Amino acid sequence: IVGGRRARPHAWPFMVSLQLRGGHFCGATLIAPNFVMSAAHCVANVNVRAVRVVLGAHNLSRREPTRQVFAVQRIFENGYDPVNLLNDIVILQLNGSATINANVQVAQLPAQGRRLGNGVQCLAMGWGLLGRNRGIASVLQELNVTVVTSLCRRSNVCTLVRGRQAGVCFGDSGSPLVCNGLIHGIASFVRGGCASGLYPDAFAPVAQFVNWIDSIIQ
Ligand SMILES: *[C@@H]1O[C@H](CO[C@@H]2O[C@@H](C)[C@@H](O)[C@@H](O)[C@@H]2O)[C@@H](O[C@@H]2O[C@H](CO)[C@@H](O)[C@H](O)[C@H]2NC(C)=O)[C@H](O)[C@H]1NC(C)=O
Ligand SMILES: *[C@@H]1O[C@H](CO[C@@H]2O[C@@H](C)[C@@H](O)[C@@H](O)[C@@H]2O)[C@@H](O[C@@H]2O[C@H](CO)[C@@H](O)[C@H](O)[C@H]2NC(C)=O)[C@H](O)[C@H]1NC(C)=O
Ligand SMILES: [Br-]
Ligand SMILES: [Br-]
């Protein structure tokens, strides 16, 4: 997250960190005790058997007892286009079930087909890079963003910070976009670099896949 702020500890108990060898590489969302939701390109060209799904985290630099770690058991993709970044969504079933508590909770999804209009205020978040060679973020970052439809494809939900250069960046992929308490987006890609100030950030549209999601997580 470039130009954002530190989130309050465990403010978003659905927020997940995908890690390889102790290193965060993507975000994800706990959509059920044994299912998370992330971007298909976050698990593309990686060893999924080595991916660790870390729940209930806040500060990645400390070993926090609030954490619950899981592995990937099953992979679900529905037409992910790696060249055009279409349907950049993957549902990952975990090797177990999370214990629901103050720090680990299931998120709420919108209704199938619900589309957000221009101007809606949303909140992005992630452990991605902080910006200009600043490096990765240890504590969870969040960012107030505004939905925009111009310079955006219908197969994406796009957001833009008005008045200043800020947005998602490397390491934020797969992280959720929260609008009105619902997960409407999965961080997918940026244009013109991070915090370009010109090109909106692009999220995979969670609403377009709810029926598919529901069919898998019952
Ligand atoms: C579900 O999986 C987790 C994760 O296991 C680690 O991550 C995988 C990618 C792979 O490297 C596995 O070999 C690893 O075990 C399990 O977490 C471990 O639990 C053991 C015993 O309780 C503990 O010693 C380890 O520290 C844990 N590993 C962590 C936290 O990374 C977890 O036990 C599995 N749960 C079930 C129900 O199978
Ligand atoms: C900056 O964003 C916060 C958070 O946005 C709200 O909550 C998110 C989880 C998501 O659902 C967004 O769509 C929401 O807009 C804004 O916080 C709310 O602010 C109102 C007062 O304006 C307050 O009554 C609520 O309690 C706040 N909700 C929180 C903190 O969760 C905040 O207003 C935004 N600020 C600016 C300057 O845009
Ligand atoms: Br901020
Ligand atoms: Br930080």
Report the nearest-CA residue for atom 9 of ligand 2: 181
d(CA 164, CA 173): 21
Is residue 70 within 8 Å of 96, Cβ to Cβ? yes
Report the nearest-CA residue for atom 11 of ligand 1: 50
Same domain, 126 and 203: yes
d(CA 83, CA 40): 12
40, 80, 88, 151, 187 from 83: Cα distances, Å: 12, 9, 10, 19, 16
The tokens for 196 are 């370009």
Residues near 56 by beta carbon (within 8 Å), at least 6 away in sequence: 10, 13, 64, 66, 67, 68, 101, 103, 104
| Range of the structural domain that residue 71 is part of | 13-106+208-218
Method underlying the structure: X-ray
Same domain, 116 and 99: no
Is residue 58 within 8 Å of 137, Cβ to Cβ? no
Which entry of 38, 88, 172, 184 is annotated as an active-site residue? 88
Same domain, 101 and 28: yes
Is the shortest distance between the CB of 179 and ligand 2 below 6 Å? Answer: yes
Same domain, 111 and 181: yes
Which residue is listed with tokens 């976050």? 42
Per DSSP, the three-state class of 40 is helix
Same domain, 37 and 98: yes
Same domain, 218 and 186: no
Same domain, 19 and 83: yes
Which entry of 173, 175, 184, 201 is annotated as an active-site residue? 173
For residue 155, how far is the Cα from the chain centroid?
Answer: 17
Residues near 109 by beta carbon (within 8 Å), at least 6 away in sequence: 31, 182, 183, 206, 207, 210, 213
Same domain, 71 and 175: no
Q: Looking at this protein, which amino acid is placed at residue 47?
A: N
The full DSSP string for 61-106 is: TS--TT-EEEEEEEEE-SS-BTTTTBS--EEEEESS-PPPSSS---
d(CA 81, CA 204): 12
50 CA: nearest ligand 1 atom: 9
Please state the length of the chain.
218
Task: Find, among 54, 75, 78, 53, the residue nearest to 66 by Cα.
Answer: 54
Resolution (Å) of this entry:
2.6
Known catalytic membership, residue 88: yes
Q: What CATH number corresponds to the domain at position 193?
A: 2.40.10.10
Question: 163-202: string of b/e by CB count within 10 Å (b at 16+)?
Answer: eeebbbbebbbbbbbbbeebbbbbbbbbeeebbeeebbbb
Measured from the Cβ of residue 117, the count of other Cβ atoms closer than 10 Å reads 7
Same domain, 92 and 139: no
Q: Count CA atoms within 13 Å of residue 61 on its CB side.
A: 5
Q: Are strands 201-205 and 176-179 parallel, antiparallel or unpaired?
A: unpaired
85: region left, alpha or beta (phi > 0 left; psi from -120 to 50 alpha): left
Known catalytic membership, residue 58: no
Task: Find, among 132, 103, 99, the residue nearest to 7 by Cα.
Answer: 103
179 CA: nearest ligand 2 atom: 13
Strand partners, 167: 2
Beta strands in the chain (DSSP E): 5-6, 15-19, 24-32, 35-38, 52-55, 68-76, 90-94, 121-126, 141-148, 157-160, 176-179, 182-189, 201-205
**157: CA distance to ligand 4 center in Å?**
26
**145: CA distance to ligand 3 center in Å?**
9
Residues with CB under 5 A from ligand 3 (ion): 4-5
* Best probe residue, ligand 2, of 105, 142, 144 (max atoms within 8 Å of C-beta): 144
d(CA 31, CA 184): 12
Which residue is listed with tokens 């950049």? 88
Backbone φ and ψ of 61, nearest 5°: -75, -20
Is the shortest distance between the CB of 96 and ligand 1 below 6 Å? Answer: yes
15, 58, 67, 71, 187 from 10: Cα distances, Å: 8, 6, 11, 21, 20
Same domain, 1 and 27: no
**78: CA distance to ligand 2 center in Å?**
33
Same domain, 195 and 121: yes
10 Å CB burial of residue 144 (0-12, 13-18, 19+) is middle
Same domain, 202 and 212: no
Measured from the Cβ of residue 61, the count of other Cβ atoms closer than 10 Å reads 9
87: region left, alpha or beta (phi > 0 left; psi from -120 to 50 alpha): left
Q: What's the total number of domains in the chain?
A: 2
